[PDB]
Scaffold this active site. Structure first.
Site, PDB file in Angstrom:
ATOM      1  N   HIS A  68     -11.834  -7.582   0.085  1.00  0.00           N
ATOM      2  CA  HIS A  68     -11.946  -6.947  -1.221  1.00  0.00           C
ATOM      3  C   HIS A  68     -13.419  -6.809  -1.571  1.00  0.00           C
ATOM      4  CE1 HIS A  68     -10.548  -5.837  -5.324  1.00  0.00           C
ATOM      5  NE2 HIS A  68     -11.725  -6.333  -5.661  1.00  0.00           N
ATOM      6  N   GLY A  69     -13.833  -5.591  -1.905  1.00  0.00           N
ATOM      7  CA  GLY A  69     -15.206  -5.317  -2.276  1.00  0.00           C
ATOM      8  C   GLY A  69     -15.293  -4.814  -3.704  1.00  0.00           C
ATOM      9  N   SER A  70     -16.388  -5.170  -4.371  1.00  0.00           N
ATOM     10  CA  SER A  70     -16.618  -4.754  -5.745  1.00  0.00           C
ATOM     11  C   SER A  70     -18.115  -4.591  -5.960  1.00  0.00           C
ATOM     12  CB  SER A  70     -16.027  -5.757  -6.742  1.00  0.00           C
ATOM     13  OG  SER A  70     -16.016  -5.228  -8.055  1.00  0.00           O
ATOM     14  N   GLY A  76     -17.616 -12.083 -13.299  1.00  0.00           N
ATOM     15  CA  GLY A  76     -16.291 -11.987 -13.885  1.00  0.00           C
ATOM     16  C   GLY A  76     -15.177 -12.204 -12.879  1.00  0.00           C
ATOM     17  N   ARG A  85      -8.168  -9.338 -11.582  1.00  0.00           N
ATOM     18  CA  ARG A  85      -7.270  -9.039 -12.685  1.00  0.00           C
ATOM     19  C   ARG A  85      -6.669  -7.647 -12.541  1.00  0.00           C
ATOM     20  NH1 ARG A  85     -12.255  -9.561 -15.285  1.00  0.00           N
ATOM     21  NH2 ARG A  85     -12.664  -9.873 -13.054  1.00  0.00           N
ATOM     22  N   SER A 126     -13.247  -2.011   2.519  1.00  0.00           N
ATOM     23  CA  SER A 126     -13.527  -2.729   1.282  1.00  0.00           C
ATOM     24  C   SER A 126     -15.018  -2.770   0.978  1.00  0.00           C
ATOM     25  CB  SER A 126     -12.970  -4.150   1.359  1.00  0.00           C
ATOM     26  OG  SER A 126     -11.615  -4.189   0.947  1.00  0.00           O
ATOM     27  N   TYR A 165     -16.517  -0.162  -1.328  1.00  0.00           N
ATOM     28  CA  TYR A 165     -16.360  -0.361  -2.761  1.00  0.00           C
ATOM     29  C   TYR A 165     -17.416  -1.284  -3.351  1.00  0.00           C
ATOM     30  CZ  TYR A 165     -11.906   2.091  -2.773  1.00  0.00           C
ATOM     31  OH  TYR A 165     -10.928   3.054  -2.685  1.00  0.00           O
ATOM     32  N   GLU A 176      -3.670  -0.096   3.027  1.00  0.00           N
ATOM     33  CA  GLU A 176      -3.956  -0.566   1.678  1.00  0.00           C
ATOM     34  C   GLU A 176      -2.869  -1.545   1.270  1.00  0.00           C
ATOM     35  OE1 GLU A 176      -4.660   2.206  -1.447  1.00  0.00           O
ATOM     36  OE2 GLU A 176      -6.260   3.279  -0.394  1.00  0.00           O
TER      37      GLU A 176
HETATM   38  N1  3JD Z   1     -11.806  -2.835  -3.679  1.00  0.00           N
HETATM   39  C1  3JD Z   1     -11.344  -2.906  -2.420  1.00  0.00           C
HETATM   40  O1  3JD Z   1     -11.809  -3.704  -1.603  1.00  0.00           O
HETATM   41  C2  3JD Z   1     -10.236  -1.972  -2.040  1.00  0.00           C
HETATM   42  C3  3JD Z   1      -9.692  -2.085  -0.784  1.00  0.00           C
HETATM   43  C4  3JD Z   1      -8.640  -1.249  -0.321  1.00  0.00           C
HETATM   44  C5  3JD Z   1      -8.104  -0.272  -1.116  1.00  0.00           C
HETATM   45  C6  3JD Z   1      -8.634  -0.116  -2.418  1.00  0.00           C
HETATM   46  C7  3JD Z   1      -8.364   0.736  -3.491  1.00  0.00           C
HETATM   47  N2  3JD Z   1      -9.214   0.378  -4.470  1.00  0.00           N
HETATM   48  C8  3JD Z   1      -9.354   0.944  -5.771  1.00  0.00           C
HETATM   49  C9  3JD Z   1      -8.280   1.486  -6.471  1.00  0.00           C
HETATM   50  C10 3JD Z   1      -8.499   2.020  -7.743  1.00  0.00           C
HETATM   51  C11 3JD Z   1      -9.773   2.010  -8.319  1.00  0.00           C
HETATM   52  C12 3JD Z   1     -10.145   2.559  -9.684  1.00  0.00           C
HETATM   53  C13 3JD Z   1      -9.347   1.926 -10.843  1.00  0.00           C
HETATM   54  C14 3JD Z   1      -9.650   2.613 -12.176  1.00  0.00           C
HETATM   55  C15 3JD Z   1     -10.887   3.494 -12.040  1.00  0.00           C
HETATM   56  N3  3JD Z   1     -10.585   4.584 -11.106  1.00  0.00           N
HETATM   57  C16 3JD Z   1     -10.131   4.088  -9.798  1.00  0.00           C
HETATM   58  C17 3JD Z   1     -10.821   1.455  -7.584  1.00  0.00           C
HETATM   59  C18 3JD Z   1     -10.624   0.922  -6.326  1.00  0.00           C
HETATM   60  N4  3JD Z   1     -10.031  -0.634  -4.135  1.00  0.00           N
HETATM   61  C19 3JD Z   1      -9.691  -0.955  -2.884  1.00  0.00           C
END
Ligand code: 3JD
Length: 353
Positions: free
Chosen positions: A200-202, A209, A216, A242, A245, A330
């Site tokens: 998971h990446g952010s 947070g 969350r 990931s 992201y 996913e």
């Molecule tokens: N964050 C991750 O590592 C990740 C891994 C695999 C699939 C993913 C799909 N997302 C993802 C799904 C939805 C959103 C946003 C949520 C609300 C803002 N517009 C899109 C951001 C990321 N993140 C993923």
């Protein structure tokens, strides 16, 4: 005051995630008016007011209203959440990707408001500010030896799962930490099967947070725009998927990767997009988006009752006949009690420049 009683690697981690000046840079790069609306004065009610403004925008987009109805809804959002385009007129939000970019702004503001409430604490004098912020995190962070067995496995999981179509960069593992958030193991579904270690990446401003409140689910007042498989916690078996992201840049090429124990249970395998797969479970516990490439079960191992899907990946023989096919998998859960964070990776992005 006195000396910091933490490991130097933890000191660098607290240094990196609690950098409020870095969150200002990222917010300015997203055209956020940090002067009119300072981050130190950000409250939950302000972010909630912006979420309700984005809902009015989502209604206009789904209703085809591109006239004055959208112009006033955008101006309402740009007023509650101040921006800075210079002397330019603010643009109209009318597409899914445009709406998704604004929701990511609000999601970042919520994680910064949590981090700012943490750094502006008290009890100054007896404890080093490094230990003050680490204690307020309520989550253990223990560095692991580079020669330890876990470091070798996570490194193999890091590189052997790097996707081929993500040739824009390579990743170098700088440091590895063990994560044990307080109260996370007491709610985890140890009974559920299909326990896997997923990535998971952010963004960088969200880690305070994330490490303090866990991963969350979006609040109900947030729009469903951007959720390919509904509101939930998204994971991936490919490390580079990931890591994209994290949104690392060429000037800021140091991010963080999170490995969590996800209780998948019975997987609901989907191909086409569906922002309502949560109601399609019916006894199932997770939604799995099928991709074209995924690691094969021949290279799978176990790490403390959790399957690590190591690489290299191969073709899955999956193709969407009437739509678009995902390149990789996913994994989505719809309850935080199915996720237990375990590892935190200090990753250096070596961009192909
Ligand atoms: N964050 C991750 O590592 C990740 C891994 C695999 C699939 C993913 C799909 N997302 C993802 C799904 C939805 C959103 C946003 C949520 C609300 C803002 N517009 C899109 C951001 C990321 N993140 C993923």
């Amino acid at each position: 005051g006195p000396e910091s009683q933490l490991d130097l690697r933890v000191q660098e981690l607290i240094k990196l995630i609690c950098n409020v000046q870095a969150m200002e840079e990222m917010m300015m790069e997203m055209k956020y008016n940090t002067k009119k609306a300072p981050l130190g004065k950000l409250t939950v009610a302000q972010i909630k007011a912006g979420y309700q403004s984005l809902k009015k925008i989502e209604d206009c987009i789904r209703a085809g209203q591109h006239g004055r109805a959208l112009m006033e809804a955008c101006n309402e959002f740009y007023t509650r959440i101040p921006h800075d385009f210079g002397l330019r007129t603010p643009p109209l939000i009318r597409t899914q990707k445009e709406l998704s970019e604004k929701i990511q702004l609000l999601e970042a503001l919520g994680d910064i408001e949590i981090a700012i409430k943490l750094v502006k604490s008290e009890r100054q004098g007896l404890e080093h500010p490094l230990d003050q912020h680490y204690r307020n995190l309520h989550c253990a962070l223990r560095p692991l030896d580079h020669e330890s067995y876990e470091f070798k496995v996570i490194s193999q999981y890091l590189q052997s799962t790097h996707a081929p179509t993500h040739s824009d960069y390579t990743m170098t593992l700088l440091d590895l930490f063990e994560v044990e958030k307080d109260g996370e193991k007491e709610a985890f579904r140890e009974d559920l099967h299909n326990r896997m270690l997923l990535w998971h990446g952010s963004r960088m401003s969200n880690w305070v947070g994330i490490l303090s409140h866990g991963l969350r689910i979006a609040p109900p007042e947030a729009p469903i725009t951007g959720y390919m498989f509904g509101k939930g916690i998204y994971f991936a078996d490919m490390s580079s998927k990931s890591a994209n992201y994290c949104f690392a840049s060429r000037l800021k090429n140091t991010g963080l990767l999170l490995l969590s124990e996800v209780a998948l249970g019975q997987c609901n395998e989907l191909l086409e997009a569906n922002p309502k797969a949560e109601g399609l479970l019916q006894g199932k516990h997770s939604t799995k988006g099928l991709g074209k490439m995924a690691p094969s079960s021949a290279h799978f191992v176990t790490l403390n009752g959790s399957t690590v899907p190591l690489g290299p990946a191969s073709d899955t023989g999956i193709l969407n006949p009437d739509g678009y096919t995902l390149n990789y998998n996913e994994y989505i859960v719809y309850n935080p009690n199915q996720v237990r964070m375990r590892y935190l990776l200090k990753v250096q992005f070596n961009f192909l420049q």
